[PDB]
């Protein structure tokens, strides 16, 4: 494409000099106390995903896209994190979530416990629990908040309040009778019972809070949207009954109410907008379901009232599902939505007393390449045909997954199908039903006070040990000691 303005060396020299001047002025370190901490988390957002999301965001506004900047690319400090588990070489969701939320690496499939426990065994989790950064923040007088686009009792958010030996125990319906006999409790019970004064909770998973065979308010005729609890306890009713009678609790469940509320008269909020996982960004309903940006804005406005500060945990957790199913368009669109939410949240707060950290838990086997020309659509074909079987191939490819297609001995001719659709699955090397994770290191972006302590290549469990250092919470209180 080669725009005219880029044909002069002076343009690049001036750009580099301006970048140098900014980086030289940045030498003044910020040694304030992080009054507020915000942690953005993208499930399965490696480096290739970030680059593809940047290109897509640029091209959505009729640009080549390569030169554009994401809202997380303006974060001054960048580091790399190793994501291996104690038990596994390729990471998982629960173990990594424990690593970067509690500060201690653990096995796979176990939430909120150390590495001395064994998966799916109740009588080995006693005395091996670990407390997450949410508990440290709440014990210091700060507010706590959880915003997710997935279930509130999914692995990534539940690693902050739950101590369970299995991540598949969503409710007592999924727990085997042996675990019930030995006294274990499902994740929803711990969500409503472990920390009894969590201010803002937002996400899906509305069918794990109701007794069995209870019709849903939103979907009347859907048989999969009914309740699943075998106790007979209404968990939302319990949640409304654990708070002082002179305060306000709402339990909104759609977008009209979320827009109607004013944060100046709300103290506790519980939003369950979907029976299970919230819908994709491209499949979302405008009228009845809110986006991540609106939920983040309302949560920030509610939590901003505390003079001691707040700790907000935001998850863009549909990237992992979009990659697992094998569709790249969806996952890139939730990456773009996550970036928009980051920008909206950063607009409200001030960088002088707020530590913002964007991170990921692992990466996938997503790849893109093939000598594509400048300005080429990221979902388009490669410029040259294959030189072995004489067929076109797309730029986006997967190491494995359900995209592996072979029609009678030869791979699929891409020109016969609509590769620009919303539900198109790119071709892969080995056929599977779900594309696996990846062992690559992940990138951690950070800005705010004491954000320069994330510099080199380090372990994952180092992330929650520096934030607690900046806010004078946890076990190390030497930042603001005399």
């Amino acid at each position, epitope marked *: 494409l080669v725009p005219e303005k880029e044909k002069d060396p002076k343009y690049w020299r001036d750009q580099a000099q301006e970048t140098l001047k900014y980086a030289l002025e940045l030498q003044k370190l910020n040694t304030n106390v992080a009054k507020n901490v915000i942690m953005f988390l993208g499930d399965g957002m490696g480096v290739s995903t970030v680059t593809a999301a940047r290109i897509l965001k640029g091209q959505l506004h009729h640009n080549p896209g390569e030169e554009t900047r994401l809202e997380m690319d303006k974060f001054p400090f960048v580091a790399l994190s190793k994501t291996y588990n104690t038990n596994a070489q390729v990471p998982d969701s629960a173990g990594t979530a424990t690593a970067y939320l509690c500060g201690v690496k653990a096995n796979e499939g176990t939430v909120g416990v150390s590495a001395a426990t064994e998966r799916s065994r109740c009588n080995t989790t006693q005395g091996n629990e670990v407390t997450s950064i949410l508990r440290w923040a709440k014990d210091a*007088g700060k*507010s706590v908040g959880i915003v997710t686009t997935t279930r509130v009792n999914h692995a990534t958010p539940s690693a902050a309040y739950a101590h369970s030996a299995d991540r598949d125990w969503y409710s007592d319906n999924e727990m085997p009778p042996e675990a019930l006999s030995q006294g274990c409790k499902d994740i929803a019970y711990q969500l409503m019972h472990n920390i009894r004064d969590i201010d803002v909770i937002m996400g899906g998973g509305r069918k794990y809070m109701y007794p069995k065979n209870k019709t849903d308010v939103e979907y009347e005729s859907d048989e999969k949207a009914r309740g699943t609890r075998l106790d007979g306890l209404d968990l939302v009713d319990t949640w409304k*009954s*654990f708070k*002082p009678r002179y305060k306000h609790s709402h339990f909104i469940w759609n977008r009209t109410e979320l827009l109607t509320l004013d944060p100046h008269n709300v103290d506790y909020l519980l939003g369950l907008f979907e029976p299970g996982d919230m819908q994709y960004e491209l499949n979302r309903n405008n009228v009845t379901d809110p986006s991540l940006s609106e939920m983040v804005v309302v949560a920030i406005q509610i939590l901003r009232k505390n*003079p*001691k500060g707040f700790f907000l945990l935001v998850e863009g957790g549909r990237i992992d599902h979009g990659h697992h199913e094998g569709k790249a368009k969806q996952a890139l669109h939730e990456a773009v939505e996550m970036d928009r939410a980051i920008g909206q949240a950063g607009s409200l707060t001030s960088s002088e007393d707020t530590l913002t950290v964007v991170t990921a838990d692992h990466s996938h086997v997503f790849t893109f390449g093939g000598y594509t020309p400048r300005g080429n659509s990221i979902f388009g074909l490669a410029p040259m045909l294959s030189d072995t079987d004489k067929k076109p191939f797309t730029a986006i490819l997967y190491g494995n997954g359900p995209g592996y297609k072979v029609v009678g001995g030869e791979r699929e001719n891409v020109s016969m199908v609509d590769y620009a659709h919303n539900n198109y699955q790119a071709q892969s090397a080995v056929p599977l039903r779900h594309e696996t994770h990846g062992g690559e290191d992940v990138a951690v972006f950070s800005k705010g006070p004491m954000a320069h302590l994330l510099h080199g290549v380090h372990e994952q469990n180092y992330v929650p040990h520096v934030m607690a250092y900046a806010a004078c919470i946890g076990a190390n209180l030497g930042h603001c000691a005399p």
Partner: single-chain antibody, 225 residues
Framework: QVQLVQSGAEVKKPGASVKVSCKASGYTFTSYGISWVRQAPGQGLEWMGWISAYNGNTNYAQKLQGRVTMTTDTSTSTAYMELRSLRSDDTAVYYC??????????????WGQGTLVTVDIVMTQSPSSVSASVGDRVTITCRASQGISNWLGWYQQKPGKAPKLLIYGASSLQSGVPSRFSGSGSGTDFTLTISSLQPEDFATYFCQQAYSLPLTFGGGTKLEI
């Protein structure tokens, strides 16, 4: 440090009003509210209301409504409480207390010196009076008429002194208190345990709930020697 100072003793006659002032120093005045507590001679603590120093909203007890007014002045950082139509049973010690934080206004952390003036969820405490020797272990039980979750606070009062906060939330130890004291229980029954007893731990203990207005204090357990 944080310190609250009140005026001197005031003697009045029935019908005349009385004003009590409480000046606080050591913190940002508008960030915390002020509660007013009353203690009759020989009886337990009684609650009148509080006032928030940020927006000025006030809450008064139903028993004393129509006679108590509460004002705040952030310019000089003072809180005033005025009472009208004094009766023969209004003689008592009035205390101004400060809450602990944002969502914890049921836990009175810092207390005033107490001004002497001369003219629902029922909380039960057991035993009425317990006697023990030095170095022993004691346990005191507090029961509520309704489920109050984990909203409970334990206070200690030595004779002639203001109450001191020991445990808030029925399981969390206040900073500056020895780890010897322990608190446990939840729902309807709560317990406070002292593993080792010392000569400087003989006083009267109270349990107060922060669930629903009005705030109710316990009857008091006299831990004698």
């Amino acid at each position: 440090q944080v310190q609250l100072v009140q005026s001197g003793a005031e003697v009045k006659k029935p019908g005349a009003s009385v004003k009590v002032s409480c000046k606080a120093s050591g913190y940002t005045f508008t960030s915390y509210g002020i509660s007013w507590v009353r203690q009759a001679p020989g009886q337990g603590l009684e609650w009148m209301g509080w006032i928030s120093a940020y927006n000025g909203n006030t809450n008064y007890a139903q028993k004393l409504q129509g006679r108590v007014t509460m004002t705040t002045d952030t310019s000089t950082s003072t809180a005033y409480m005025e009472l009208r139509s004094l009766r023969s049973d209004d003689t008592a010690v009035y205390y101004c207390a400060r809450d602990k934080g944002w969502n914890s206004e049921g836990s009175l952390e810092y207390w005033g010196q107490g001004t002497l003036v001369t003219v629902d969820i029922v909380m039960t405490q057991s035993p009425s009076s317990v006697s023990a020797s030095v170095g022993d272990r004691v346990t005191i039980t507090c029961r509520a008429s309704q489920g109050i979750s984990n909203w409970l606070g334990w206070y200690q009062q030595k004779p002639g002194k203001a109450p001191k906060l020991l445990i808030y939330g029925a399981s969390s130890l206040q900073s500056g208190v020895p780890s010897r004291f322990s608190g446990s229980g939840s729902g309807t029954d709560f317990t406070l345990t002292i593993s080792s007893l010392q000569p400087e731990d003989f006083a009267t203990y109270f349990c107060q709930q922060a669930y629903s207005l009005p705030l109710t204090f316990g009857g008091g357990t006299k831990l004698e020697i």
